[PDB]
Amino acid sequence: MIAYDITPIDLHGHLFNVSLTIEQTNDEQELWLPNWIPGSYLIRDFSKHIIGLHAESNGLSLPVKQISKNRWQLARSKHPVTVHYQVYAWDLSVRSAYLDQFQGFFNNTSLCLAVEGQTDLPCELHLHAPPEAPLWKVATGMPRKSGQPHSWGCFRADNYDALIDYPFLIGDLTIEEFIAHGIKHSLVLSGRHYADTSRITADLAKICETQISLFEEAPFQSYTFLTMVVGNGFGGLEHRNSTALLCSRKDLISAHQYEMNDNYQTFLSLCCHEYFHSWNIKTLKPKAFLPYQLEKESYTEQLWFYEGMTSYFDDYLLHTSGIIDEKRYLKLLGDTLSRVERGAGQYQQSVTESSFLAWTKFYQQNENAPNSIVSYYAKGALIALSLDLMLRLQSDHKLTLARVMKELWHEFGKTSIGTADDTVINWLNQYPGIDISDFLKDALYNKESLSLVELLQNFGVMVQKQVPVDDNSVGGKASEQPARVNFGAKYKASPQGLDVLNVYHDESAYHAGLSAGDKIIAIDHLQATEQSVKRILERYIPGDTVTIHAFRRDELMTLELTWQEPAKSSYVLSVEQPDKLKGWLTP
Ligand SMILES: [Zn+2]
Numbered sequence: 001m002i003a004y005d006i007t008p009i010d011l012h013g014h015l016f017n018v019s020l021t022i023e024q025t026n027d028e029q030e031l032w033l034p035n036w037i038p039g040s041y042l043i044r045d046f047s048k049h050i051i052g053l054h055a056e057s058n059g060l061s062l063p064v065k066q067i068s069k070n071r072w073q074l075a076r077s078k079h080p081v082t083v084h085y086q087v088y089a090w091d092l093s094v095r096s097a098y099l100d101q102f103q104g105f106f107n108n109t110s111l112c113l114a115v116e117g118q119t120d121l122p123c124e125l126h127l128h129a130p131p132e133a134p135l136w137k138v139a140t141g142m143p144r145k146s147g148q149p150h151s152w153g154c155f156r157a158d159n160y161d162a163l164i165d166y167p168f169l170i171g172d173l174t175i176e177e178f179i180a181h182g183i184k185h186s187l188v189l190s191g192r193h194y195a196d197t198s199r200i201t202a203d204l205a206k207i208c209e210t211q212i213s214l215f216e217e218a219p220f221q222s223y224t225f226l227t228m229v230v231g232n233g234f235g236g237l238e239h240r241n242s243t244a245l246l247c248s249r250k251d252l253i254s255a256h257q258y259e260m261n262d263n264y265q266t267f268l269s270l271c272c273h274e275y276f277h278s279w280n281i282k283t284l285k286p287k288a289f290l291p292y293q294l295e296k297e298s299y300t301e302q303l304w305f306y307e308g309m310t311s312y313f314d315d316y317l318l319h320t321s322g323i324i325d326e327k328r329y330l331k332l333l334g335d336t337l338s339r340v341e342r343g344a345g346q347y348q349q350s351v352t353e354s355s356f357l358a359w360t361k362f363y364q365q366n367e368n369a370p371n372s373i374v375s376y377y378a379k380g381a382l383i384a385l386s387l388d389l390m391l392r393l394q395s396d397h398k399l400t401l402a403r404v405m406k407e408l409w410h411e412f413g414k415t416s417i418g419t420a421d422d423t424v425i426n427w428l429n430q431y432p433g434i435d436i437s438d439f440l441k442d443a444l445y446n447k448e449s450l451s452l453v454e455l456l457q458n459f460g461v462m463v464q465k466q467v468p469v470d471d472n473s474v475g476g477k478a479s480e481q482p483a484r485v486n487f488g489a490k491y492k493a494s495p496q497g498l499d500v501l502n503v504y505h506d507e508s509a510y511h512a513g514l515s516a517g518d519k520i521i522a523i524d525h526l527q528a529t530e531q532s533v534k535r536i537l538e539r540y541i542p543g544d545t546v547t548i549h550a551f552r553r554d555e556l557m558t559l560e561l562t563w564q565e566p567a568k569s570s571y572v573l574s575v576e577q578p579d580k581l582k583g584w585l586t587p
Contacts, residue, residue: 001122008130011101014090020083030116032071034294037109042363046110053085094237094244103171103190108164123163125155137173139188141242142166167244169226176201180208184222191229195252210321219283238277273314281306284413303355308380326585330573334476337571343370367516371505389455394434460577465568478572485540485563493530512561522549
């Protein structure tokens with residue numbers, strides 16, 4: 001058994017003190033730290049935050065040398081060895097570790113070195129109260145061995161893999177418990193907020209019960225939603241019996257807000273997304289992740305399923321559980337549809353290829369993303385949408401994609417068997433009464449658009465495309481105010497000008513020679529601002545030419561731009577034939 005002692009020792013310095021005790025080390029024992037954390041496919045080199053590491057054995061300092069960016073080698077010893085080090089935690093995200101005088105958060109991939117060769121043995125973790133903040137509370141899904149329930153104490157994990165899958169959140173925590181199908185759940189909040197926890201918790205109970213009913217079984221015995229609340233932030237990371245979320249304070253509905261709003265909906269969608277991951281990705285997962293190799297990139301083209309299906313259900317289950325109506329849901333659907341269809345990237349990269357290169361193409365994507373890559377999240381979501389609709393028509397509404405998820409989970413998930421790249425398609429190709437082979441293969445390996453118009457028509461859903469109100473409003477929401485022209489580029493407007501974020505290939509901005517990073521200062525010799533950009537553009541029609549003045553770094557460019565026929569990129573979805581819904585949606 002390996003023992004870990006952690007103490008948030010320096011709040012102002014953002015430093016955790018960490019001790020590791022190895023009862024018996026091997027000859028020239030090695031210690032290593034993951035270079036990436038499960039669920040976030042980007043090499044992050046956490047080891048860089050480890051500071052002043054040293055070792056000791058039998059009352060004497062023990063020599064230890066660092067042999068690589070994330071690996072240490074200990075001198076031989078006949079006695080137990082204790083390794084001491086500090087960890088710098090100043091990254092506000094659900095991914096590494098953060099610590100100041102107001103709160104603390106951490107993933108053990110960042111704090112706990114793994115003992116080479118003894119990684120399958122149990123790991124004990126002793127969390128000591130920070131001397132500077134002893135009244136702080138503790139929240140985590142890691143099995144507790146001692147201490148008051150939301151306070152300091154000892155925890156145990158079956159092995160290193162389990163250890164690094166239990167994030168910790170400490171501070172002046174707000175904790176609201178609830179139950180879904182006899183299982184205990186917790187909503188935990190850290191940060192300034194005005195959340196009506198009873199109401200949010202009541203909605204989570206609904207979402208959660210819907211999911212447990214869906215799989216007809218839960219892979220955990222309790223679940224905790226660890227939430228950091230800031231002014232402007234988004235993000236979440238799934239775990240076997242918990243999730244770490246970073247959300248905006250405006251997303252947590254207050255006691256004085258009766259109706260549902262887009263922000264609170266985004267939060268519920270996020271929670272629904274991480275929760276679903278409990279089955280999809282935490283238990284049911286690709287074989288390449290059984291076990292995880294955390295020293296280097298681990299390639300798999302299956303994220304179209306593990307992220308795609310989840311990206312379809314996080315919103316859909318919100319309507320299915322009765323949190324949002326079909327109007328809100330279809331707006332979200334149109335948003336997704338519009339995003340996938342917006343750029344040329346869909347014709348440059350297949351969805352499986354995108355999953356495979358998540359480590360570079362996706363996680364290290366830049367301004368040219370819409371022109372060169374496709375989202376395995378968004379397109380995977382549309383694939384899921386297609387399968388759900390196709391399976392329903394082919395089985396006369398007896399087989400839903402939800403049902404398929406349940407079954408796939410019991411077969412390959414609950415059993416820890418794992419899925420190979422072709423498992424899901426073959427599983428469907430050998431399912432009595434349904435054939436989706438040609439469709440799925442093209443959806444998965446070709447670089448073209450998917451046909452959902454006909455599919456949605458069969459369920460009474462009408463699809464109409466139109467020009468968004470502006471370059472930054474590609475939604476699934478109509479507007480009596482469609483634009484006649486547009487840059488074919490996203491931008492951030494302010495009194496100082498329009499900061500260009502993305503330039504779409506072969507469109508207006510592109511031909512004029514504008515680039516991401518440039519700052520448009522004037523259009524047709526008129527000051528361009530947040531206030532004036534739309535007024536200025538309601539004066540042109542395709543074919544008109546104007547001069548654009550913009551700065552590239554500190555150089556002022558005088559460019560000529562001719563407004564093209566703008567793309568009808570907003571896919572607005574609406575139900576026109578209710579009786580054709582057949583239960584997919586509730587009017
Ligand atoms: Zn996800």
